[PDB]
Design a protein that fits this description.
This is part of a larger assembly, with chains A and B.
Chain A: H1 47-52, H2 62-75, E1 81-87, H3 93-108, E2 116-122, H4 132-140, H5 147-157, E3 168-174, H6 186-192, E4 201-206, H7 219-225, E5 230-232, H8 241-247, E6 254-258, E7 270-276, H9 278-289, H10 295-315, E8 325-327, H11 329-340, H12 343-348, H13 353-366, E9 374-375, H14 376-387, H15 400-404, H16 417-424, E10 428-430, E11 440-443, H17 448-456
Parallel strand pairs in A: 1-4, 1-5, 2-3, 3-4, 7-8
Antiparallel strand pairs in A: 6-7, 9-11, 10-11
Helix pairs in contact in A: 2-3, 4-5, 6-7, 9-10, 9-11, 10-11, 13-14
Chain B: H1 2-8, H2 16-27, E1 37-41, H3 48-56, E2 65-66, E3 76-79, E4 82-83, H4 93-101, H5 114-118, E5 126-132, H6 147-154, E6 162-167, E7 175-178, H7 184-194, H8 208-214, H9 218-234, H10 238-245, H11 249-252, H12 256-271, H13 277-289, H14 302-312, E8 315-321, E9 329-335, H15 339-345
Parallel strand pairs in B: 1-6, 1-7, 3-5, 4-5, 5-6
Antiparallel strand pairs in B: 2-3, 8-9
Classes of the chains: A alpha/beta, B alpha/beta.
Bound molecules: adenosine-5'-triphosphate and magnesium ion (MG) (2 copies).
């Protein structure tokens, strides 16, 4: 609707208690995605390892105690604060806040702290930047208003409404950099409500850079967030070791009952024991922390290494989908070599002679003038110049009849397939020009890796 | 608990110099029924909104109260609070004032501009408005200064009674009052005045004096609140120093391999000024081949090291254009660190010399 919360009642004292209403603070698409199974899912000894390594807190002690202490001193005391969380994308920022709210929910049932409402608002999970006001008003009040009516309703509710008929609201501002607009009106309104007395709103902002309010936001929004900021340090090499071992605690160094007929494994017919080498975990967690320290990257390396070992185990036996399996360091090293490799070098080495001649002609023009901007008319003149080098010899004239006449006397001497092929591959560039002679051609890839492919032919 | 009420915390402390100047503007506009506009500026943190909200909540058709004149009289004064940033359009600021003054039982009229708002205040009663943050009313020079110029002319002509008190952020001109920032002695009095309702004070007189001078009001509240959460998580004079230190260091947190690439990034920007990511990778490879130490890295993995310096706050990567003949869009690399601290951390290991 269009009527805000300021016109719902008559006066301030006329507003009843919102906690006794069967509509405030939250007071059908899981049945269509179900089907009957007419077979049997054969799970091998490597199926349980991949499922436990998925993304669905021993390395976070000081960060978990700082967020829990900031909310415990505001919910019980009936106050409002702002918690800032910044760090590398993939260090357990949202999981740490989710564990704090989950721990506070168990303490509220023990008649220790007052009841609160957890609201999860994600900036990247919204189409429009102004859609965050409709989601917050629907989870607190329960109505469905527009972006203009929900903005004025939250201001009137977080100010004139007293604390005796209110309730604590914990809002997790996921993806803080996604709600950054031009007018900076949504970011300022979400931080100004925490500075009010009759608010009782807990805002936990989660971003990716510590200098976000000092670069995008101004001095007015930065003064409302707070000087104390929690920096989420990335995981090192000794912290990622216990992460993988915790997910595979009951699976590592354990015996299984793998069947020799189908290949079904039963966690406690052969007694196949699954053991993962400790050296493969140290060499994998050290490479992840040396790049960015992503928590999901450390779990994807062990999952990819187990997938490669499962492919060779099923192919050598002939199982299907329907003595001791040891994952060595070769499967882990092959999982990290498929990503760090560069397929641009091997791509130019498998091209045809027409595609290889266009790259060799472009590199030769750069060593003569040195401008990194050769026109299309210069490449055509340089290609014909290399053909007429040894035209009197019979060994070179065999290719001139195909590149200019295709082995036909009726076809005249020619002057598009290899040009547009390198453009879509992200290797060659071409400016928007209607002419086919003065159109400059630039290289997108490096120059050192381009000369290695021409010498390999 | 005394630690729960301390973290949660009509004359404001350290503001008697500006409180009397604000009340003096209303002594000549309500008593004489004259329209005038007021302008209040100052940096954020001077307590401008807390000063205006305290006057309305003390000494002050819906929204009707009574104001006490210095000589002793009674008048119908209507005071409202309307924020400029809490609106949808800056041109629709005249409609919000009508909804905050006219009663809901009467007919609701539509206001378009000045001609529809001046006729309503002609029969009437002192209408007091508090327009917070008037700097956002401009349309981001002729068409920009339109809402401010229209609202200033509405509170200048006679025959009506409309006052305007705005709080901006740092012959018919408004009275400009610059809000002075709080110093060391000004921030110390507000702390004792705000925490005067508490029975026991667990703070030390020497700890508040350090936080008051180092923060020179919103920044001081975050410092005192952080000391309570830290002390309660581990179980004074040293409690105030831990809040300013917990919120050369960015270099020691990196590895030896990341320091070699970082040393070559600033080296390429000195002999070539403007450089890109493609040119910085070629300079780093040719610099480590003469020394024959450490294995080189491919161009695909070169961006992984630069991403660590960008997240920590040492290398800024932007998107600009070129200056030569091929002026195309390319990714340029830049830094934002000091040269004094850079030539002092890598020299302590005594293992690299030509790379600096
Ligand atoms: N101690 C831990 N042990 C195991 N997995 C962890 C641990 N901490 C975090 N994770 C994993 O981190 C993953 C990402 O967590 P989260 O949602 O907080 O991400 P983030 O740090 O905000 O960054 P991003 O989601 O953008 O990569 C989760 O799926 C979770 O499995
Ligand atoms: Mg996240
Ligand atoms: Mg203010």
């Amino acid at each position: 609707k269009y009527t805000p919360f300021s016109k719902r009642f008559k006066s301030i004292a006329a507003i009843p208690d919102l906690t006794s209403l069967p509509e405030f603070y939250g007071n059908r698409f899981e049945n269509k995605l179900k089907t009957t199974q007419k077979h049997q899912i054969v799970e091998t000894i490597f199926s349980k390892v991949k499922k436990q390594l998925n993304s669905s807190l021993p390395a976070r002690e000081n960060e978990f105690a700082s967020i829990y202490l900031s909310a415990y001193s505001a919910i019980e005391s009936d106050s409002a604060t702002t918690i800032y969380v910044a760090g590398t994308p993939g260090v357990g920022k949202t999981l740490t806040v989710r564990e704090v709210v989950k721990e506070l929910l168990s303490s509220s049932a023990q008649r220790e702290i007052p009841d609160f409402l957890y609201v999860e608002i994600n900036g990247l999970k919204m189409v429009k930047p102004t859609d965050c006001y409709e989601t917050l008003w629907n989870k607190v009040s329960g109505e469905r208003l527009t972006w203009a009516a929900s903005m004025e309703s939250l201001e009137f509710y977080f100010k004139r409404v007293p604390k005796n008929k209110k309730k604590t609201i914990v809002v997790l501002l996921d993806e803080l950099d996604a709600m950054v607009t031009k007018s900076q009106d949504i970011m300022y309104n979400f931080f100004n409500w925490t500075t009010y007395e009759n608010a009782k709103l807990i805002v936990i902002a989660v971003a990716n850079t510590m200098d976000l309010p000092e670069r995008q936001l101004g001095n007015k929004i930065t003064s409302r967030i707070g000087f104390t900021r929690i920096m989420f340090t990335g995981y090192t090499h000794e912290e990622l070791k216990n992460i993988i071992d915790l997910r595979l605690k009951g699976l590592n160094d354990s015996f299984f009952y793998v069947d020799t007929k189908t290949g079904n494994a039963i966690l406690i017919v052969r007694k196949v024991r699954l053991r993962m080498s400790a050296d493969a975990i140290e060499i994998a967690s050290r490479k992840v922390a040396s790049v960015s320290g992503d928590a999901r990257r450390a779990l994807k390396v062990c999952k990819r290494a187990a997938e490669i070992a499962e492919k060779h185990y099923m192919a050598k036996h002939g199982y299907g989908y329907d003595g001791v399996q040891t994952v060595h360091i070769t499967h882990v090293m092959k999982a990290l070599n498929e990503t760090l490799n560069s397929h641009v070098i091997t791509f130019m080495t498998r091209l045809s002679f027409t595609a290889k001649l266009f790259i060799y002609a472009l590199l030769n023009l750069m060593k003569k003038n040195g401008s990194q901007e050769q026109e299309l008319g210069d490449i055509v003149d340089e290609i014909k110049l290399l053909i007429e080098v040894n035209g009197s010899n019979k060994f070179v004239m065999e290719i001139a009849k195909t590149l200019f006449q295709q082995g036909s006397d009726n076809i005249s001497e020619q002057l598009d397939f290899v040009l547009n092929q390198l453009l879509d591959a992200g290797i060659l560039f071409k400016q928007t020009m209607k002419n086919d002679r003065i159109c400059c051609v630039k290289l997108n890839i490096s120059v050192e890796e381009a000369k290695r492919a021409m010498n390999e032919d | 608990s005394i630690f729960l009420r301390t973290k949660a915390l009509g004359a404001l402390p350290a503001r008697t110099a500006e409180y009397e100047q604000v009340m003096n503007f209303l002594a000549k506009a309500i008593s004489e029924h004259r329209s005038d506009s007021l302008y209040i500026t100052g940096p954020p943190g001077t307590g401008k909104t807390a000063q205006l909200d305290m006057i309305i909540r003390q000494k002050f058709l819906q929204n009707l109260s009574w104001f006490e004149l210095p000589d002793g009289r009674l008048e119908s004064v209507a005071v409202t609070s309307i924020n400029c940033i809490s609106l949808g359009e800056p041109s629709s600021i005249f409609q919000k004032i009508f909804d905050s003054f006219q009663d809901l039982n009467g007919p609701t009229l539509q206001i378009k501009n000045m001609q529809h708002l001046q006729k309503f205040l002609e029969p009437y009663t002192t209408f007091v408005v508090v327009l917070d943050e008037m700097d956002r009313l401009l349309h981001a020079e002729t068409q920009s200064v339109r809402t401010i110029l229209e609202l200033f002319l509405l509170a200048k002509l006679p025959t009506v009674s409309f006052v305007l008190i705005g709080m901006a952020n740092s012959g018919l001109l408004p009275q400009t009052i610059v809000f002075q920032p709080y110093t060391a002695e000004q921030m110390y009095e507000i702390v004792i005045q705000k925490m005067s309702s508490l029975p026991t004070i667990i703070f030390q007189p020497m700890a508040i004096k350090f936080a008051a001078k180092k923060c020179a009001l919103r920044k001081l509240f975050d410092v005192l609140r952080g000391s309570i959460e830290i002390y309660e998580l581990e179980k004074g004079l040293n409690y105030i120093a831990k809040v300013f230190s917990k919120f050369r260091t960015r270099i020691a947190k990196l590895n030896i391999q990341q320091k070699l690439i970082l040393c070559t990034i600033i080296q390429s920007l000195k002999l070539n000024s403007d450089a890109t990511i493609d040119e910085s990778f070629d300079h780093y490879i040719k610099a480590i081949t003469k020394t024959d130490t450490l294995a080189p890295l491919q161009r695909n993995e070169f961006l992984e090291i630069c991403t660590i310096l960008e997240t920590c706050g040492l290398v800024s990567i932007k998107k600009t254009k070129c200056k030569g003949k091929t002026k195309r869009f390319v990714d340029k690399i830049d830094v934002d660190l000091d040269m004094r601290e850079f030539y002092d951390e890598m020299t302590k290991i005594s293992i690299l010399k030509p790379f600096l």
